[PDB]
Amino acid sequence: GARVLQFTNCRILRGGKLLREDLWVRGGRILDPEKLFFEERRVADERRDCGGRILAPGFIDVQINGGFGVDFSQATEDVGSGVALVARRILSHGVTSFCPTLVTSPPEVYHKVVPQIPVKSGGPHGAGVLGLHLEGPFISREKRGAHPEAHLRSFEADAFQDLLATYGPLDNVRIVTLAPELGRSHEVIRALTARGICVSLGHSVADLRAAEDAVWSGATFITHLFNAMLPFHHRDPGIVGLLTSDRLPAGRCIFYGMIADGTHTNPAALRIAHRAHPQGLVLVTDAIPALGLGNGRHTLGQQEVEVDGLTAYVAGTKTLSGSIAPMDVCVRHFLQATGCSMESALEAASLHPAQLLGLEKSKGTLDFGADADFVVLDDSLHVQATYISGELVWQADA
Amino acid sequence: GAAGARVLQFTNCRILRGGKLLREDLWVRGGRILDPEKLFFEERRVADERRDCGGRILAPGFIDVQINGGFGVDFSQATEDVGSGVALVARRILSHGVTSFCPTLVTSPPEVYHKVVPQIPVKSGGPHGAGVLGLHLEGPFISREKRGAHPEAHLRSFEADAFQDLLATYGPLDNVRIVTLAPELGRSHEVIRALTARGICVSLGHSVADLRAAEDAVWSGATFITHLFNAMLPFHHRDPGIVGLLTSDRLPAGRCIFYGMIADGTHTNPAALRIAHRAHPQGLVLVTDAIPALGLGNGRHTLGQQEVEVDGLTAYVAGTKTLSGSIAPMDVCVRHFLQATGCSMESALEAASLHPAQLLGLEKSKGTLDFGADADFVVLDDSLHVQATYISGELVWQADA
Ligand SMILES: N[C@@H]1[C@@H](O)[C@H](O)[C@@H](COP(=O)(O)O)O[C@@H]1O
Ligand SMILES: N[C@@H]1[C@@H](O)[C@H](O)[C@@H](COP(=O)(O)O)O[C@@H]1O
Ligand SMILES: [Zn+2]
Ligand SMILES: [Zn+2]
């Protein structure tokens, strides 16, 4: 663990620019070479030539419901094995941290599954688990999307105590998506953020003012913008209006997820959001359990999903269930659709989600002191290799 | 001639030049802006007259490409003296900072066009009022589903004989500068080509067209969008519609698509002005879309074949909650655009002048304070209230003070 690694002949993403600069690593952390040189030595124990390729912080996916046959919203015999399988497979997508996401389920499912998915550091076993993202059940009936109507719930009884009874202990929970128009959402948002949980707005028929109120109550994220929310209207902007709002707490950057799989939103939607509020854009996969399996029928929590073509509908409906697009595919599609810089596309998949979760000192950057989680990319942003804590954990067949 | 004409120098002023407010004098001769360094170099001449501007802002005079009348005048009426109504509006809008405009006619029966269109030719600006750049004919070749305030009974389509139907409806087009149409109408391609071949700007509006149909119309020659967001399908993330033109990457290279916005605080909320301005700032054109009741306050009035009731600060088609147009003068729109978007003063001023000038290919003579341009400009205080209006270097309106 004490070895000094030096990555040379590389362009690194630092401060929003690709710099021709070496990356120094020891004990899983990025090192300041000026400080290393003065205090210790100048010669690394190992040099690795990167052939001019790009090193960028490892991707962070804060919304993924499963994959490769695994459905996080199922109380199976070995919940942990399913999480570890997905965590391992998404290394090949450039993902080094993620939030396993559960969808609207009966309380007993939460009680069995939630304690089985704790935080875990990344390594050769797979991407690190940052905590659970619980999407629903405290969401709107009118914008339930693929969530089962039977298991939706409201707050009005006794607000946060109803949420605690539904989910069970929240120690392992990092994010909760809710619809803020629900009665007593204010109390719930306050109680959740007081416990360090990120509150996201989604699956909601709330208007702009209600959404702005929820941000003042503590909300900091929007769940897959444009999907499962009222559209933008010029005399009724809705939640999309948060991207241009000047009525939020001063200095606060509202973050918002976008599914850039080429099916959930057209290029115009990616462009208009990126141009209105670039700093807040967070790429998420919202991947469903059928990710990586091709066509067929599989599950998503309590619902059944029909995948045919590159599109996943709730069976018997034309309601999209989620994406089958890996994160690296989303990064490239975002880049192509918006014409943004490579730096901007890479930041939306790593820096921005890290900032959302308050992790920007340890994840999402190649800054001094941060964890050495990074991907090796060619100029087309195809992932050649994935590193966690300075250790090679995935390498492309080529 | 240059040798014989007087040199006027405006001093103690900030001027809008190259997108920046510069503490720099404005020099004028023969009605056009001159380079002082070159004048001294080639002629060793200084100003024959200096005018101290008290530290105020000089900006190119506003250009309003969509105004249906004002102060009781309705351009879409075949009245006894159509020209007198145009001159009245042209004079009054000098106090709004407007030095050029396009009188706009709404969906009307052919007989109205045949009588009115020939009575409203281009006319240079002066003490008589803002210059008339030509007519803007909005409708009748627009969709029924997004007709907005236009009367259903007088809508028309192209399918019969395309451009010859348009020519028979409007009459001779010599005086016409802009036509708004809905591009999903059958045979719109042929009409767009024939209109642009005659130098007429084609605008897209009052339409249920989708993005690809809108992009096709730009490839055929269309260069404007009529009051973005109003009377068109809303933006959807899997169906962008006409708003999607603001972010399209498949339009002709190097050419800017322009779009009008009514920044009166009633037609669109601040988020809509912000999202458009951030997506495509260079294309934004402020238009008043002013109705004949502009400057009259509440009451009942006309808009072509329709009746309009102004109540509160809102002008509805009588008996409906359908907005007919605005009662906001251009300078009011400029100040509201500035406030609602938080943009720079320069950006607000450019949206009311530079951009409409570029739309109409007039950027070398209007909409700028560049050397060689016409000396049409407004004197503004720091809040962008109009204190005085100049045309061809001559003072043509001044605030009471
Ligand atoms: N996970 C969400 C679904 O819940 C939603 O149904 C779908 C389509 O949303 P929309 O039709 O509102 O764009 O997007 C995502 O997949
Ligand atoms: N001149 C147009 C009207 O024709 C239209 O009805 C109005 C409202 O349009 P919308 O309700 O689609 O925003 O905008 C402008 O006023
Ligand atoms: Zn969702
Ligand atoms: Zn109109």
Residue numbers in the entry:
A (entry chain B): 9 to 406
B (entry chain A): 6 to 406
The authors write:
AMDHD2 is an amidohydrolase that plays a potential role in the HBP by catalyzing the deacetylation of GlcNAc-6P in the ‘reverse’ direction of the pathway. Human AMDHD2 is organized into two domains, a deacetylase domain responsible for the conversion of GlcNAc-6P into GlcN6P and a second small domain with unknown function (DUF). The structure of the deacetylase domain showed a TIM (triosephosphate isomerase) barrel-like fold. In summary, our data show that human AMDHD2 is an obligate dimeric protein with high specificity for GlcNAc-6P that carries a single catalytic Zn ion in the active center.
